[PDB]
């Protein structure tokens, strides 16, 4: 924002100076004389009698806006040994032109910088539906239909201070690059659109004197492969004094916004609302989660069969995250392209007033089981070899290498999660599982000590240890699947002696162990952060793994209240020894384990308590923009 004014003794120069910019003088170019002096009016400060040498720097600064055009003046008097002083005149008009936004991230350089010492305003994607009896997200049209909609938007203000006749001969234009105009929309308040997808520039109607003009800005797209997340809005001051010449830019200024990313919440963030769509065949399951929700002080919402279309897997069609700006935080549903019976639920029931909506991927096919959000989780806050991840790290399951028979989460999804930047995704190995979800082998639960959590992992090892121990104590005859009328009981001794079952579970152990070490490296975990949950598996179709008995790690974590699938283990001394083992592991952390009968309703259809439910949790207090990804 430098300006070099050429002064000439042939004729007076006229020029505008925007306060806060650098104005310098070319005194030599058109000089007559050896020396020069400068005299200015009191409102102009000259930094710099001197010789007429090109390298002499003369800079002008004005203290305040002009009351009238040319109301400040500079007189450069050129003189020499035998030469009467020759004067050149410069008439100046000072103005204030400041485009302001919440760049300190509280309440209202042109670079956006991350961290607690950084600078740059935040913009939210206007992806919720505050409008009354409507179907569209607020950002899809070009009007503000509700006053509360403005709460989601970012305030930008143009303060000007000029002479009363200034815009007779100057005009301000507000603009956005054509490459960015599809991702933002800006409204002028008195609300109507001035900038947006169809309109990259607008002539502002601005009166002279002191004026303040308010704009509200909404983002229309999340960061993604094609969009780093920055929007720049610019004000240009144009000289329109000459009716026979094009307009001339005399000043530009900008504000850069960053669009807020979609952020997930781990199991360690306090729960606010529990979801089930357990209106289908069975009500006792639904009774148990309802009791847990009540216990954990959560709102409860349930999706009935008429809307379910017999799709009970509430975990899988969606993930409830949030977006956060200094002025506004709101939950936002990421809708999976899974699109099974629950397809309409996120659209029709979850998005709404102060509940946003995002989706990715192809919506009519081209998808896989790894696109179900049982395969989408996040770790608690972690620090990894000095690098801090204060919002945790997204975890999703993959194959170990791409083959003709391997599955992955769709690239569009993977690409969206990475572009949010703030929970740096980690690919885990889940494709050994029939269903294929990371929620089939891991969970996180709060803990009052160490890093504030434990990683729980399914463990065949722990279960064989448990069963061998019982057998060693004379309980070899004890029956797995006691309590189940429509099932073949199996004795501890027969389970242990089964060599194929053992081989299968060794292969599974290896798969989970691979993930263990991977989580250890990528989350900075030590063994002491990890608890193994006794769990047997069996290989079936395509040698893919399924739970031998109810997969206890596929649990609903509602703070210290846990909803754990009931394994129906061998009953020794009046109690299922699996439940007893799990309790011995988790109760010491102050966790309360509730065992829920999901056997014929969920287990038998390839999922458990976690798979049949979902949870909205409290957003992190840590502000994402304060991270340095």
């Amino acid at each position: 924002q430098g300006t070099l004014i050429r002064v000439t003794p042939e004729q007076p120069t006229h020029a505008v100076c925007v306060l806060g910019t650098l104005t310098q003088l070319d005194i030599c170019s058109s000089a007559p004389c050896t020396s020069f002096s400068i005299n200015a009016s009191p409102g102009v400060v000259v930094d710099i009698t001197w010789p007429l040498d090109p390298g002499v720097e003369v800079t002008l600064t004005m203290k305040a806006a002009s009351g009238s055009t040319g109301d400040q003046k500079v007189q450069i008097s050129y003189y020499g040994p035998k030469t009467p002083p020759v004067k050149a005149l410069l008439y100046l008009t000072a103005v204030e032109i400041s485009l302001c936004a919440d760049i300190t991230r509280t309440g209202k350089q042109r670079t956006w910088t991350w961290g607690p010492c950084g600078q740059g305003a935040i913009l939210l994607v206007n992806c919720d539906r505050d409008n009354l009896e409507s179907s569209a997200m607020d950002c899809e049209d070009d009007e503000v239909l509700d006053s509360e909609d403005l709460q989601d938007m970012s305030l930008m203000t143009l303060s000007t201070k000029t002479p009363k006749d200034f815009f007779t001969n100057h005009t301000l234009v507000l603009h956005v690059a054509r490459s960015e105009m599809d991702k933002v929309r800006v409204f002028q308040a008195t609300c109507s659109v001035v900038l947006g997808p169809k309109w990259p520039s607008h002539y502002l109607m601005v009166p002279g004197g002191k004026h303040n003009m308010d704009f509200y800005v909404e983002a229309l797209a999340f960061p993604d492969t094609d969009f780093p997340g920055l929007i720049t809005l610019t004000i240009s001051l144009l000289d329109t004094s000459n009716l026979e010449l094009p307009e001339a830019v005399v000043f530009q200024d900008s504000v850069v916004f960053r669009v807020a990313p979609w952020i997930m919440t781990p199991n360690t963030q306090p729960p606010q609302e529990v979801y089930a769509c357990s209106i289908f065949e069975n009500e006792d399951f639904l009774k148990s989660v309802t009791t847990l929700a009540m216990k954990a002080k959560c709102k409860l919402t349930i999706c009935p069969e008429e809307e379910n279309m017999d799709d009970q897997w509430m975990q899988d069609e969606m993930e409830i995250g949030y977006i956060q700006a200094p002025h506004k935080t709101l939950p936002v549903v990421f809708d999976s392209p899974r699109n099974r019976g629950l397809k309409e639920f996120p659209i029709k029931r979850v998005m709404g007033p102060d509940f946003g909506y995002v989706t990715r991927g192809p919506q009519t096919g081209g998808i896989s089981g790894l696109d179900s959000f049982g395969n989408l989780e996040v770790s608690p806050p972690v620090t990894v070899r000095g690098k801090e991840y204060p919002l945790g790290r997204i975890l999703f399951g993959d194959s170990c290498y791409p083959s003709n028979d391997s599955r992955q989460m769709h690239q569009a999804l993977q690409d969206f999660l990475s572009a949010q930047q703030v929970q740096a995704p980690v690919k885990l190995y889940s494709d050994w599982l029939s269903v294929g979800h990371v929620d089939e082998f891991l969970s996180f639960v709060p803990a009052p000590d160490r890093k504030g959590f434990r990683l729980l992992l399914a463990s065949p090892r722990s279960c064989y240890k448990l069963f061998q121990e019982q057998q060693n104590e004379g309980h070899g005859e004890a029956l797995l699947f006691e309590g189940i009328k429509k099932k073949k009981q199996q004795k501890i001794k027969n389970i242990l002696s089964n060599k194929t079952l053992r081989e299968h579970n060794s292969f599974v152990e290896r798969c989970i162990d691979w993930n263990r070490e991977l989580l250890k490296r990528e989350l900075g975990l030590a063994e002491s952060d990890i608890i193994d949950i006794p769990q047997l598996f069996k290989l079936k179709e395509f040698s893919k793994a399924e739970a031998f008995f109810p997969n206890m790690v596929n649990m609903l974590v509602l703070g210290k209240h846990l909803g754990i699938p009931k394994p129906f283990g061998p009953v020794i001394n009046g109690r299922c020894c699996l439940e007893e083992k799990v309790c011995s592991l988790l109760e010491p952390l102050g966790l309360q384990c509730t065992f829920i009968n999901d056997f014929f309703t969920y287990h038998i259809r390839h999922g458990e308590v976690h798979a049949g439910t979902n949870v909205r949790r409290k957003p992190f207090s840590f502000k994402w923009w304060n991270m340095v990804p």
Binding site: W313, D316, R340, S434, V435, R605, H606, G607
Partner: peptide, 5 residues
Amino acid sequence: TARKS
């Protein structure tokens, strides 16, 4: 009706 497909 299974989790799988």
